[PDB]
mmCIF file of all heavy atoms in Angstrom:
data_model
loop_
_atom_site.group_PDB
_atom_site.id
_atom_site.type_symbol
_atom_site.label_atom_id
_atom_site.label_comp_id
_atom_site.label_asym_id
_atom_site.label_seq_id
_atom_site.Cartn_x
_atom_site.Cartn_y
_atom_site.Cartn_z
ATOM 1 N N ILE A 195 -1.664 -10.911 4.588
ATOM 2 C CA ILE A 195 -2.391 -9.924 5.392
ATOM 3 C C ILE A 195 -3.637 -10.583 5.975
ATOM 4 O O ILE A 195 -4.413 -11.185 5.226
ATOM 5 C CB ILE A 195 -2.753 -8.718 4.543
ATOM 6 C CG1 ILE A 195 -1.483 -8.010 4.074
ATOM 7 C CG2 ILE A 195 -3.649 -7.755 5.355
ATOM 8 C CD1 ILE A 195 -1.736 -6.963 2.989
ATOM 9 N N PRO A 196 -3.873 -10.506 7.288
ATOM 10 C CA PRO A 196 -5.051 -11.170 7.861
ATOM 11 C C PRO A 196 -6.338 -10.690 7.216
ATOM 12 O O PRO A 196 -6.526 -9.497 6.978
ATOM 13 C CB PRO A 196 -4.988 -10.791 9.345
ATOM 14 C CG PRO A 196 -3.515 -10.581 9.601
ATOM 15 C CD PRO A 196 -2.968 -9.988 8.323
ATOM 16 N N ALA A 197 -7.237 -11.639 6.959
ATOM 17 C CA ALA A 197 -8.457 -11.306 6.232
ATOM 18 C C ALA A 197 -9.243 -10.175 6.875
ATOM 19 O O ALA A 197 -9.719 -9.294 6.137
ATOM 20 C CB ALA A 197 -9.350 -12.545 6.085
ATOM 21 N N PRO A 198 -9.438 -10.134 8.196
ATOM 22 C CA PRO A 198 -10.250 -9.055 8.767
ATOM 23 C C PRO A 198 -9.634 -7.683 8.634
ATOM 24 O O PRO A 198 -10.363 -6.696 8.794
ATOM 25 C CB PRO A 198 -10.376 -9.445 10.250
ATOM 26 C CG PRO A 198 -9.997 -10.878 10.325
ATOM 27 C CD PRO A 198 -8.996 -11.088 9.226
ATOM 28 N N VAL A 199 -8.325 -7.571 8.430
ATOM 29 C CA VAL A 199 -7.732 -6.246 8.331
ATOM 30 C C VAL A 199 -7.509 -5.827 6.876
ATOM 31 O O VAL A 199 -7.359 -4.627 6.613
ATOM 32 C CB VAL A 199 -6.431 -6.140 9.161
ATOM 33 C CG1 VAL A 199 -6.618 -6.776 10.525
ATOM 34 C CG2 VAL A 199 -5.219 -6.744 8.472
ATOM 35 N N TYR A 200 -7.559 -6.763 5.925
ATOM 36 C CA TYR A 200 -7.226 -6.447 4.534
ATOM 37 C C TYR A 200 -8.198 -5.430 3.960
ATOM 38 O O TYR A 200 -7.806 -4.552 3.180
ATOM 39 C CB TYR A 200 -7.256 -7.730 3.696
ATOM 40 C CG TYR A 200 -6.863 -7.518 2.249
ATOM 41 C CD1 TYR A 200 -5.535 -7.465 1.889
ATOM 42 C CD2 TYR A 200 -7.819 -7.350 1.261
ATOM 43 C CE1 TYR A 200 -5.160 -7.237 0.579
ATOM 44 C CE2 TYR A 200 -7.457 -7.138 -0.059
ATOM 45 C CZ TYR A 200 -6.129 -7.080 -0.389
ATOM 46 O OH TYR A 200 -5.739 -6.864 -1.697
ATOM 47 N N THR A 201 -9.465 -5.521 4.340
ATOM 48 C CA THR A 201 -10.516 -4.669 3.808
ATOM 49 C C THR A 201 -10.703 -3.363 4.578
ATOM 50 O O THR A 201 -11.581 -2.564 4.213
ATOM 51 C CB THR A 201 -11.830 -5.461 3.791
ATOM 52 O OG1 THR A 201 -12.062 -6.028 5.094
ATOM 53 C CG2 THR A 201 -11.741 -6.601 2.768
ATOM 54 N N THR A 202 -9.918 -3.118 5.629
ATOM 55 C CA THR A 202 -10.096 -1.898 6.404
ATOM 56 C C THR A 202 -9.659 -0.674 5.596
ATOM 57 O O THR A 202 -8.800 -0.767 4.716
ATOM 58 C CB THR A 202 -9.295 -1.925 7.702
ATOM 59 O OG1 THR A 202 -7.894 -2.059 7.405
ATOM 60 C CG2 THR A 202 -9.789 -3.030 8.621
ATOM 61 N N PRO A 203 -10.229 0.493 5.894
ATOM 62 C CA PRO A 203 -9.768 1.715 5.213
ATOM 63 C C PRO A 203 -8.272 1.923 5.323
ATOM 64 O O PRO A 203 -7.612 2.322 4.353
ATOM 65 C CB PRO A 203 -10.546 2.829 5.926
ATOM 66 C CG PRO A 203 -11.754 2.167 6.471
ATOM 67 C CD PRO A 203 -11.350 0.757 6.810
ATOM 68 N N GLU A 204 -7.718 1.635 6.501
ATOM 69 C CA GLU A 204 -6.284 1.819 6.725
ATOM 70 C C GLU A 204 -5.444 0.965 5.781
ATOM 71 O O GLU A 204 -4.530 1.469 5.121
ATOM 72 C CB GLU A 204 -5.940 1.486 8.174
ATOM 73 C CG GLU A 204 -6.377 2.541 9.199
ATOM 74 C CD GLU A 204 -7.808 2.372 9.705
ATOM 75 O OE1 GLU A 204 -8.576 1.513 9.206
ATOM 76 O OE2 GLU A 204 -8.159 3.090 10.655
ATOM 77 N N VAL A 205 -5.693 -0.349 5.733
ATOM 78 C CA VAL A 205 -4.882 -1.189 4.867
ATOM 79 C C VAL A 205 -5.158 -0.872 3.402
ATOM 80 O O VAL A 205 -4.234 -0.831 2.588
ATOM 81 C CB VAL A 205 -5.119 -2.671 5.195
ATOM 82 C CG1 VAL A 205 -4.444 -3.570 4.189
ATOM 83 C CG2 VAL A 205 -4.594 -2.943 6.602
ATOM 84 N N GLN A 206 -6.419 -0.606 3.048
ATOM 85 C CA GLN A 206 -6.718 -0.230 1.664
ATOM 86 C C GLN A 206 -5.995 1.050 1.270
ATOM 87 O O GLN A 206 -5.513 1.168 0.139
ATOM 88 C CB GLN A 206 -8.220 -0.091 1.468
ATOM 89 C CG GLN A 206 -8.943 -1.424 1.502
ATOM 90 C CD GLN A 206 -8.634 -2.268 0.285
ATOM 91 O OE1 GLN A 206 -8.818 -1.808 -0.842
ATOM 92 N NE2 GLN A 206 -8.134 -3.492 0.495
ATOM 93 N N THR A 207 -5.867 2.003 2.198
ATOM 94 C CA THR A 207 -5.097 3.217 1.920
ATOM 95 C C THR A 207 -3.617 2.901 1.700
ATOM 96 O O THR A 207 -2.975 3.465 0.799
ATOM 97 C CB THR A 207 -5.268 4.227 3.064
ATOM 98 O OG1 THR A 207 -6.606 4.726 3.078
ATOM 99 C CG2 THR A 207 -4.313 5.395 2.892
ATOM 100 N N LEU A 208 -3.043 2.002 2.518
ATOM 101 C CA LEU A 208 -1.647 1.630 2.316
ATOM 102 C C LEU A 208 -1.460 0.972 0.960
ATOM 103 O O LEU A 208 -0.486 1.252 0.249
ATOM 104 C CB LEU A 208 -1.168 0.714 3.444
ATOM 105 C CG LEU A 208 -1.102 1.369 4.816
ATOM 106 C CD1 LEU A 208 -0.742 0.332 5.841
ATOM 107 C CD2 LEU A 208 -0.085 2.502 4.873
ATOM 108 N N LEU A 209 -2.370 0.077 0.576
ATOM 109 C CA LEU A 209 -2.254 -0.558 -0.728
ATOM 110 C C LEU A 209 -2.395 0.466 -1.848
ATOM 111 O O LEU A 209 -1.641 0.433 -2.822
ATOM 112 C CB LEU A 209 -3.310 -1.667 -0.862
ATOM 113 C CG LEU A 209 -3.225 -2.869 0.082
ATOM 114 C CD1 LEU A 209 -4.507 -3.694 -0.015
ATOM 115 C CD2 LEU A 209 -2.032 -3.740 -0.216
ATOM 116 N N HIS A 210 -3.342 1.391 -1.714
ATOM 117 C CA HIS A 210 -3.607 2.361 -2.773
ATOM 118 C C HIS A 210 -2.444 3.324 -2.938
ATOM 119 O O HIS A 210 -2.040 3.622 -4.067
ATOM 120 C CB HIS A 210 -4.887 3.132 -2.466
ATOM 121 C CG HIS A 210 -5.179 4.218 -3.454
ATOM 122 N ND1 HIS A 210 -5.722 3.966 -4.695
ATOM 123 C CD2 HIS A 210 -4.981 5.555 -3.393
ATOM 124 C CE1 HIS A 210 -5.858 5.104 -5.351
ATOM 125 N NE2 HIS A 210 -5.412 6.082 -4.585
ATOM 126 N N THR A 211 -1.889 3.809 -1.823
ATOM 127 C CA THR A 211 -0.784 4.763 -1.898
ATOM 128 C C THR A 211 0.486 4.092 -2.396
ATOM 129 O O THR A 211 1.239 4.696 -3.172
ATOM 130 C CB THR A 211 -0.544 5.453 -0.553
ATOM 131 O OG1 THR A 211 -0.264 4.489 0.467
ATOM 132 C CG2 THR A 211 -1.756 6.238 -0.162
ATOM 133 N N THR A 212 0.753 2.832 -1.987
ATOM 134 C CA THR A 212 1.874 2.090 -2.566
ATOM 135 C C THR A 212 1.711 1.986 -4.072
ATOM 136 O O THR A 212 2.652 2.232 -4.827
ATOM 137 C CB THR A 212 1.979 0.689 -1.935
ATOM 138 O OG1 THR A 212 2.192 0.842 -0.518
ATOM 139 C CG2 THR A 212 3.136 -0.092 -2.517
ATOM 140 N N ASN A 213 0.516 1.578 -4.514
ATOM 141 C CA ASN A 213 0.182 1.437 -5.931
ATOM 142 C C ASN A 213 0.481 2.719 -6.709
ATOM 143 O O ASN A 213 1.262 2.705 -7.674
ATOM 144 C CB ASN A 213 -1.302 1.036 -5.999
ATOM 145 C CG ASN A 213 -1.808 0.741 -7.407
ATOM 146 O OD1 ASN A 213 -1.385 1.342 -8.391
ATOM 147 N ND2 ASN A 213 -2.764 -0.188 -7.500
ATOM 148 N N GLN A 214 -0.096 3.836 -6.272
ATOM 149 C CA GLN A 214 0.022 5.072 -7.045
ATOM 150 C C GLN A 214 1.424 5.659 -6.967
ATOM 151 O O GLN A 214 1.936 6.169 -7.974
ATOM 152 C CB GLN A 214 -1.016 6.084 -6.582
ATOM 153 C CG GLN A 214 -2.439 5.725 -6.966
ATOM 154 C CD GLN A 214 -2.704 5.719 -8.483
ATOM 155 O OE1 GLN A 214 -1.922 5.200 -9.282
ATOM 156 N NE2 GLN A 214 -3.827 6.300 -8.872
ATOM 157 N N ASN A 215 2.062 5.607 -5.794
ATOM 158 C CA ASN A 215 3.426 6.108 -5.684
ATOM 159 C C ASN A 215 4.326 5.406 -6.683
ATOM 160 O O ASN A 215 5.059 6.042 -7.442
ATOM 161 C CB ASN A 215 3.941 5.927 -4.262
ATOM 162 C CG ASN A 215 5.404 6.290 -4.122
ATOM 163 O OD1 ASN A 215 6.265 5.632 -4.694
ATOM 164 N ND2 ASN A 215 5.692 7.322 -3.348
ATOM 165 N N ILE A 216 4.267 4.075 -6.715
ATOM 166 C CA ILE A 216 5.144 3.326 -7.607
ATOM 167 C C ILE A 216 4.797 3.610 -9.065
ATOM 168 O O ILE A 216 5.701 3.829 -9.893
ATOM 169 C CB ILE A 216 5.085 1.830 -7.261
ATOM 170 C CG1 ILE A 216 5.833 1.622 -5.927
ATOM 171 C CG2 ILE A 216 5.684 0.989 -8.357
ATOM 172 C CD1 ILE A 216 5.681 0.238 -5.288
ATOM 173 N N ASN A 217 3.503 3.664 -9.405
ATOM 174 C CA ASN A 217 3.117 3.953 -10.792
ATOM 175 C C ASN A 217 3.697 5.286 -11.245
ATOM 176 O O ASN A 217 4.198 5.411 -12.365
ATOM 177 C CB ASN A 217 1.595 4.033 -10.957
ATOM 178 C CG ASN A 217 0.863 2.711 -10.727
ATOM 179 O OD1 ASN A 217 1.382 1.648 -10.965
ATOM 180 N ND2 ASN A 217 -0.403 2.818 -10.346
ATOM 181 N N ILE A 218 3.587 6.310 -10.409
ATOM 182 C CA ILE A 218 3.903 7.646 -10.893
ATOM 183 C C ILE A 218 5.391 7.920 -10.777
ATOM 184 O O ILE A 218 5.952 8.607 -11.637
ATOM 185 C CB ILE A 218 3.043 8.695 -10.179
ATOM 186 C CG1 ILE A 218 1.543 8.393 -10.450
ATOM 187 C CG2 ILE A 218 3.396 10.116 -10.656
ATOM 188 C CD1 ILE A 218 1.158 8.029 -11.931
ATOM 189 N N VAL A 219 6.071 7.353 -9.774
ATOM 190 C CA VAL A 219 7.530 7.399 -9.776
ATOM 191 C C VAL A 219 8.060 6.726 -11.035
ATOM 192 O O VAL A 219 8.956 7.249 -11.702
ATOM 193 C CB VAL A 219 8.117 6.770 -8.496
ATOM 194 C CG1 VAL A 219 9.611 6.525 -8.631
ATOM 195 C CG2 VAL A 219 7.840 7.671 -7.280
ATOM 196 N N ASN A 220 7.484 5.577 -11.414
ATOM 197 C CA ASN A 220 7.904 4.979 -12.679
ATOM 198 C C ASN A 220 7.581 5.894 -13.863
ATOM 199 O O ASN A 220 8.396 6.031 -14.786
ATOM 200 C CB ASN A 220 7.263 3.603 -12.905
ATOM 201 C CG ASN A 220 7.520 3.087 -14.308
ATOM 202 O OD1 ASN A 220 6.779 3.394 -15.259
ATOM 203 N ND2 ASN A 220 8.576 2.314 -14.455
ATOM 204 N N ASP A 221 6.391 6.510 -13.892
ATOM 205 C CA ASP A 221 6.093 7.393 -15.015
ATOM 206 C C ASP A 221 7.141 8.494 -15.132
ATOM 207 O O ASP A 221 7.580 8.837 -16.241
ATOM 208 C CB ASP A 221 4.714 8.027 -14.881
ATOM 209 C CG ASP A 221 3.562 7.081 -15.240
ATOM 210 O OD1 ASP A 221 3.793 5.896 -15.537
ATOM 211 O OD2 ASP A 221 2.393 7.552 -15.215
ATOM 212 N N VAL A 222 7.541 9.086 -14.005
ATOM 213 C CA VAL A 222 8.503 10.183 -14.087
ATOM 214 C C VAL A 222 9.846 9.676 -14.589
ATOM 215 O O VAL A 222 10.474 10.271 -15.481
ATOM 216 C CB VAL A 222 8.634 10.884 -12.723
ATOM 217 C CG1 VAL A 222 9.814 11.875 -12.725
ATOM 218 C CG2 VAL A 222 7.348 11.622 -12.380
ATOM 219 N N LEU A 223 10.287 8.540 -14.071
ATOM 220 C CA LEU A 223 11.626 8.067 -14.365
ATOM 221 C C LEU A 223 11.710 7.265 -15.656
ATOM 222 O O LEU A 223 12.827 7.083 -16.176
ATOM 223 C CB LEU A 223 12.133 7.247 -13.169
ATOM 224 C CG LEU A 223 12.349 8.092 -11.897
ATOM 225 C CD1 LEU A 223 12.753 7.263 -10.658
ATOM 226 C CD2 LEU A 223 13.435 9.152 -12.138
ATOM 227 N N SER A 224 10.586 6.795 -16.205
ATOM 228 C CA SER A 224 10.593 6.123 -17.509
ATOM 229 C C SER A 224 10.047 7.020 -18.623
ATOM 230 O O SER A 224 9.863 6.556 -19.756
ATOM 231 C CB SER A 224 9.810 4.803 -17.442
ATOM 232 O OG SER A 224 8.418 4.976 -17.119
ATOM 233 N N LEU A 225 9.842 8.304 -18.331
ATOM 234 C CA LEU A 225 9.240 9.242 -19.284
ATOM 235 C C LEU A 225 10.006 9.294 -20.598
ATOM 236 O O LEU A 225 9.413 9.220 -21.685
ATOM 237 C CB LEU A 225 9.209 10.627 -18.669
ATOM 238 C CG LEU A 225 8.640 11.746 -19.535
ATOM 239 C CD1 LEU A 225 7.227 11.479 -20.015
ATOM 240 C CD2 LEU A 225 8.706 13.040 -18.743
#
């Protein structure tokens, strides 16, 4: 990811939502 865009709110939101979606989908399916 290019350095100037990695820290933008947009890319940080994509990283954060990927992170949480995967964590919680795993929580539901590995419960």
Side-chain angles (χ1 to χ4, degrees):
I195 296 168
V199 316
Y200 183 82
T201 52
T202 60
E204 286 87 353
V205 172
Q206 289 290 305
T207 291
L208 294 175
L209 296 168
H210 176 78
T211 58
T212 300
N213 184 326
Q214 289 295 45
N215 174 294
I216 288 170
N217 294 330
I218 300 316
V219 167
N220 171 274
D221 283 4
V222 170
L223 293 175
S224 62
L225 179 57

